[PDB]
Write a protein that binds this ligand. Structure first.
Ligand SMILES: CCCCCCCCCCCCCCCCCC(=O)OC[C@H](COP(=O)([O-])OCC[N+](C)(C)C)OC(=O)CCCCCCCCCCCCCCCCC
Ligand SMILES: CCCCCCCCCCCCCCCCCC(=O)OC[C@H](COP(=O)([O-])OCC[N+](C)(C)C)OC(=O)CCCCCCCCCCCCCCCCC
Ligand SMILES: *[C@@H]1O[C@H](CO)[C@@H](O[C@@H]2O[C@H](CO)[C@@H](O)[C@H](O)[C@H]2NC(C)=O)[C@H](O)[C@H]1NC(C)=O
Ligand SMILES: *[C@@H]1O[C@H](CO)[C@@H](O[C@@H]2O[C@H](CO)[C@@H](O)[C@H](O)[C@H]2NC(C)=O)[C@H](O)[C@H]1NC(C)=O
Ligand SMILES: CC(C)CCC[C@@H](C)[C@H]1CC[C@H]2[C@@H]3CC=C4C[C@@H](O)CC[C@]4(C)[C@H]3CC[C@]12C
Ligand SMILES: CC(C)CCC[C@@H](C)[C@H]1CC[C@H]2[C@@H]3CC=C4C[C@@H](O)CC[C@]4(C)[C@H]3CC[C@]12C
Ligand SMILES: CC(C)CCC[C@@H](C)[C@H]1CC[C@H]2[C@@H]3CC=C4C[C@@H](O)CC[C@]4(C)[C@H]3CC[C@]12C
Ligand SMILES: CC(C)CCC[C@@H](C)[C@H]1CC[C@H]2[C@@H]3CC=C4C[C@@H](O)CC[C@]4(C)[C@H]3CC[C@]12C
Ligand SMILES: CC(C)CCC[C@@H](C)[C@H]1CC[C@H]2[C@@H]3CC=C4C[C@@H](O)CC[C@]4(C)[C@H]3CC[C@]12C
Ligand SMILES: CC(C)CCC[C@@H](C)[C@H]1CC[C@H]2[C@@H]3CC=C4C[C@@H](O)CC[C@]4(C)[C@H]3CC[C@]12C
Ligand SMILES: CC(C)CCC[C@@H](C)[C@H]1CC[C@H]2[C@@H]3CC=C4C[C@@H](O)CC[C@]4(C)[C@H]3CC[C@]12C
Ligand SMILES: CC(C)CCC[C@@H](C)[C@H]1CC[C@H]2[C@@H]3CC=C4C[C@@H](O)CC[C@]4(C)[C@H]3CC[C@]12C
Ligand SMILES: O=C(O)c1cccnc1Nc1cccc(C(F)(F)F)c1
Ligand SMILES: O=C(O)c1cccnc1Nc1cccc(C(F)(F)F)c1
Lengths: 515, 515
């Protein structure tokens, strides 16, 4: 198994290298298939748009200390390294809401205490570099084995709901910014962006979203359909999202008059605010002499940042490398936790954000490479060039501004909704949530339906909604960085309370390692 | 069989009365089911909107000689009579494109020759009253037996394509009338209707259409799905279009600012133009003494009007009363042709327009009453109160203006697109057109796939497209009232050329009476 206690110091790192690197030729040569090129295109727009979204949200909140340029270079650099060195290349490394909430929370603290933020992270980085090596030394990444399906399901579901919620709030914002009014003022500037509201902007956006999501779902239906020859049907199905986007991007191109929000990158490869910082950030104070207490008190935030990246990256790896998916290569949790956290702490030195292995984009990347037949899984295309070319494109995103400038965010929102529903494909919790509305006569022929009672099977599914409810309440409240500690409290339940209120035969059936 | 030559004078009319009228108690008492009330609501909006559409088109073209008021009263009066007296009440009687093209063509002639149009039709009416009785006397409605599936298929398909084409051209017209412009003038009157173009009108219409059609198709998918209890799932599925409309009508109600075209009826039960005509039209000239040559030369148009109504109403009756549909009551072609044409010729006397039995609304009405199980057909709800209550509502359409005034045409266009695809459900031509794109390995297990060769089976399907192509070309060209003569030339092919180029075993399999 991958999470066995070796005992020998850095045995978990070495066995993960001894596991995957013998298959390094297959990790390059399995990327010649056309389904992989279709994944690169799909996952590029999946990887880029958050780097633009979170990039803008950071700058706005951190006064350009770290913005779109630093996140794009981080996401590009760490992505290329992790693509070439990672134990699971299908893990797409990038910046997340969890991290966004920390950066702004550390800034808000740094301004109050009179500390140079871009410097304060370089210390947090050194502790993340220290803590990860100390964990990887004692094979602490083994603890992944104790992360059960139950928690992986709650993690798989909660983030899928958030990614869907964020997508709609992104469309709702266009109706708030450009409401359906009887009259509109045309004496408004459009150089920075529309100052006041405009006609035809918000409904065309809705149409551009609804159109792309439609063309996405129909092409997913078409992929595993009976129409057209098998060779042409799979190619069209594999290039589903690329065709979905291309159509609805051309739709808006031929609408000359109507404005709608496009993709926005910086002018070139420059620091967001030259007055604030440089490329390389000095630990002992860039301007004002940095205090000695924060140089050692940065461990407390780093312990928090570690957990956020750990429980994000590792649970993502469990979900992406499940037995039910045909994962021939395997997975290395020790090397993945080392790289993701290690690169992040080093990235802080250059005033660029530390990243994690985000589930949706990682899941989406695997799902886009996962083949289907007859339906069941036959062979999941496992290689590095997919995860590499995504990071390379996110690096070149600033240089290829003329191509991105004609792509509406409305079109991208259609694909994020598709990614949201596509992520819920192989989640037994969602599949059990479906049985809540189905009558008991029509339930699927699965062990947890046959061997367990229906009224008890729904109570388990119900207790996971009690978790999701509490998990969603913590997300909204000020104490949002306490979510990892509430998510890791999920294990104690499945280990004590659930067994205490259930029969062992039911758990094994309900919560199984494989199907 | 229904179309047997009795020989005895009016034997075909009497046997159709002796057929159905013993089941007259079941023709009332099968309308207590909730699926029938759902059909009334659906088919009302299906029956009304064309009475508004074609009414406006007549008035516009005939200078209010016959407009929305006369078509609504005709469609109401003839509908109630035919609902109570008809051999097949599922036939929804109303005005069609075929008739629209005649009325405007007879007006265009009447103005040139200096003839009172509203008077000239009263003569055409007398010949329609004469010709139908002469046909029903010799059981001429028997000729229906010779109308093969091949022609019924071409008829079923061509009209379904037209009804879909007309629906989209109705949406395209909103984008022509309210284009996506950079600027809009708000110094425009809205009393008659918007004079110049407006913002948010065209895309909200598109959204209102796309929304209703979505909610229609998902509820049709939900109807024969596994979710929710069987008692509640069928009710929601049966009231599919009523719920689809209700949602998207409320959507637009809560949009205060944005204009979009609503349902428009006249003020009250009045003649469209009091200056032109009255209620009852005098045959020997209302104002100017009507010429004696037109009193007898009105037979030539009446012969044309007869054929248009005959080939519309009878082929509709064959399609609605096919063996594959569970039609327990049966059908009477002699009594249906008598009423539809007889009432029409009498309706001309009051300047009101003559109607036909239109296929889509008749098919839609049967399809809405046709139940599904497991899928296959179990029992088609055959009754009169459905066809009655539709005509009663179309009569009350002017009185219930405050309810219709809040219903957008955009919402109705969603339902006409649903009706368009719903009409193509049980058509072997469409089902064979699907096999054109399917590979030959995946073709359905049906006699005409098993017993006939695939390459020969597609050539038959291909020759029907050669017909549809020619049929569609005649529709566009000036000689549009020659379509019935090109449609009745379909029989000679299936009778001579097709058998000449095919093997008898193939025809029986391809062109079968039952499945
Ligand atoms: C199970 C399916 C149910 C879902 C239903 C809806 C599907 C999702 C939405 C539609 C798919 C994407 C199409 C986007 C087209 C954008 C139209 C537009 O505004 O731009 C062009 C233009 C916009 O104007 P314009 O400004 O570009 O005009 C160009 C010409 N100049 C510039 C000179 C004025 O619109 C049109 O011309 C009208 C076309 C409308 C598109 C037709 C769709 C009708 C909606 C009903 C249902 C649609 C399909 C149903 C799905 C299943 C199929 C059986
Ligand atoms: C089978 C797979 C594909 C089929 C579905 C194809 C996708 C598009 C379907 C077209 C119809 C849209 C849904 C029904 C009608 C609701 C829209 C409406 O009128 O309100 C929007 C309204 C109308 O615009 P509005 O904001 O002006 O509303 C009025 C409010 N004022 C005037 C005050 C500003 O906009 C919203 O508020 C947006 C919320 C809805 C977001 C929908 C985005 C489209 C994404 C697809 C959703 C539906 C498919 C999901 C299921 C299929 C597969 C899982
Ligand atoms: C770029 O950095 C400069 C400082 O190097 C920022 O200037 C500060 O602005 C904040 C509020 O915006 C003030 O509270 C500080 O007093 C300013 N400090 C100095 C030294 O000017 C500036 O805001 C930053 N600009 C951007 C791009 O946000
Ligand atoms: C109502 O009927 C009158 C009476 O025919 C119509 O008046 C005619 O108008 C047309 C052109 O619109 C002229 O060619 C005729 O010379 C007019 N005749 C008379 C006697 O006035 C009038 O157009 C009709 N109005 C409506 C509602 O269309
Ligand atoms: C040295 C620290 C601060 C740098 C961070 C990376 C650490 C964890 C890396 C760098 C070099 C690595 C060592 C390189 C070689 C070997 C020999 C092998 O037979 C056992 C593992 C061992 C001993 C590795 C353990 C992990 C290691 C110490
Ligand atoms: C312009 C932006 C918004 C969209 C970019 C999408 C582009 C790159 C996508 C959309 C459709 C794609 C094509 C779809 C199918 C095939 C056939 C395959 O045998 C080779 C690749 C090829 C030819 C793809 C190349 C990439 C492609 C052209
Ligand atoms: C194809 C693979 C190997 C590379 C893809 C990403 C490349 C193009 C990106 C990633 C990070 C980028 C660098 C980031 C920062 C700087 C500093 C600036 O003062 C000059 C440009 C320079 C040096 C950039 C050049 C382009 C760069 C190297
Ligand atoms: C915060 C909110 C949304 C919590 C929602 C939890 C819901 C879905 C849970 C809580 C209790 C659960 C119920 C507990 C017991 C039973 C009885 C059984 O015979 C059928 C299922 C049924 C009826 C469950 C269905 C799901 C249920 C209603
Ligand atoms: C005015 C007449 C001549 C032409 C119009 C015929 C109309 C009114 C129809 C409708 C009802 C019909 C009658 C119904 C029943 C019968 C009984 C049958 O054993 C002989 C024919 C006879 C008597 C029919 C003759 C034609 C008839 C009278
Ligand atoms: C206002 C316009 C646009 C829409 C009108 C549609 C109305 C009449 C439709 C929409 C949904 C329908 C309801 C749907 C389901 C049921 C349950 C059934 O057991 C009795 C009828 C009843 C209660 C229907 C009555 C009619 C209804 C309310
Ligand atoms: C419920 C069933 C029986 C009837 C439904 C339709 C009714 C309401 C319609 C159909 C035709 C209509 C009539 C058509 C013409 C006129 C002439 C006008 O000068 C007064 C109203 C009057 C007399 C209408 C009254 C309402 C009416 C009788
Ligand atoms: C005028 C335009 C619209 C063409 C209309 C007729 C078309 C659809 C017809 C004419 C001849 C037909 C082809 C005749 C023979 C074959 C060989 C068979 O193994 C597959 C179908 C195929 C390839 C047919 C497909 C449909 C076809 C191309
Ligand atoms: O989802 C948010 O907005 C959020 C914000 C702050 C902290 N945690 C958050 N949630 C969240 C989402 C995914 C993974 C994780 C986890 F890895 F830390 F467990 C947390
Ligand atoms: O559909 C048209 O545009 C049209 C116009 C004039 C005559 N005939 C037409 N077509 C048409 C449509 C359905 C049924 C019939 C028929 F019944 F007359 F055969 C004709």
């Amino acid at each position: 198994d991958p999470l066995q206690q070796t005992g020998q110091l850095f045995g978990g790192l070495v066995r993960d290298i001894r596991r995957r690197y013998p298959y390094y030729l297959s990790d390059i040569t399995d990327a010649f298939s056309p389904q992989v090129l279709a994944a690169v295109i799909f996952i590029y727009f999946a990887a880029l748009s958050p780097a633009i979204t979170f990039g803008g949200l950071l700058g706005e909140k951190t006064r350009n200390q770290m913005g779109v340029s630093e996140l794009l270079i981080s996401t590009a650099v760490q992505g290329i390294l992790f693509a070439l060195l990672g134990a699971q290349p299908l893990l797409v490394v990038g910046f997340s809401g969890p991290l966004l909430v920390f950066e702004e929370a550390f800034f808000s603290f740094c301004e109050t205490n009179g500390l140079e933020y871009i410097v304060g992270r370089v210390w947090i980085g050194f502790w993340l570099i220290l803590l990860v090596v100390l964990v990887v030394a004692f094979e602490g990444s083994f603890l992944v084995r104790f992360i059960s399906r139950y928690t992986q399901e709650i993690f798989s579901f909660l983030i899928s709901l958030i990614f869907i919620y964020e997508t709609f709030s992104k469309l709702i914002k266009i109706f708030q910014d450009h409401p359906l009014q009887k009259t509109y003022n045309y004496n408004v500037l459009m150089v920075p962006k529309p100052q006041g509201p405009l006609p035809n902007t918000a409904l065309l956006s809705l149409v551009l979203m609804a159109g792309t999501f439609f063309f996405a779902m129909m092409l997913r239906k078409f992929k595993n359909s009976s129409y057209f020859p098998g060779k042409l049907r799979r190619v069209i199905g594999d290039f589903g999202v690329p065709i979905s986007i291309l159509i609805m991007v051309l739709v808006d191109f031929f609408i000359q008059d109507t404005y709608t929000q496009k993709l926005s990158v910086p002018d070139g490869f420059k620091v967001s605010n030259s007055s604030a910082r440089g490329w390389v950030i000095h630990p002992l104070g860039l301007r004002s002499e940095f205090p000695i207490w924060m140089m050692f008190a940065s461990a407390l935030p780093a312990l928090l940042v570690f957990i956020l990246i750990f429980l994000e990256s590792q649970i993502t790896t469990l979900i992406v490398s499940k037995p039910e998916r045909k994962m021939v290569k395997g997975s290395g949790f020790h090397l993945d936790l080392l790289l993701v956290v290690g690169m992040g702490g080093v990235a802080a030195l250059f005033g660029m954000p530390w990243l994690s292995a985000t589930t949706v984009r990682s899941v989406t990347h695997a799902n886009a490479l996962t083949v289907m037949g007859k339906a069941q899984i036959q062979e999941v295309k496992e290689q590095r060039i997919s995860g590499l070319l995504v990071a390379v494109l996110v690096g070149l995103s600033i240089l290829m501004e003329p191509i991105l400038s004609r792509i509406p965010l409305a079109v991208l929102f259609g694909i994020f909704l598709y990614m949201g529903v596509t992520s819920l494909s192989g989640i037994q919790l969602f599949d059990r949530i479906l049985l809540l509305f189905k009558p008991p006569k029509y339930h699927p022929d699965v062990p947890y339906v046959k061997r367990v009672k229906t009224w008890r099977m729904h109570l388990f599914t119900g207790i996971q909604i009690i978790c999701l409810a509490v998990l969603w309440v913590v997300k909204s409240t000020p104490a949002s960085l306490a979510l990892p500690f509430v998510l890791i409290l999920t294990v104690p339940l499945r280990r004590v309370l659930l067994p205490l209120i259930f029969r062992n035969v039911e758990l094994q059936c309900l919560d199984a390692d494989d199907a």
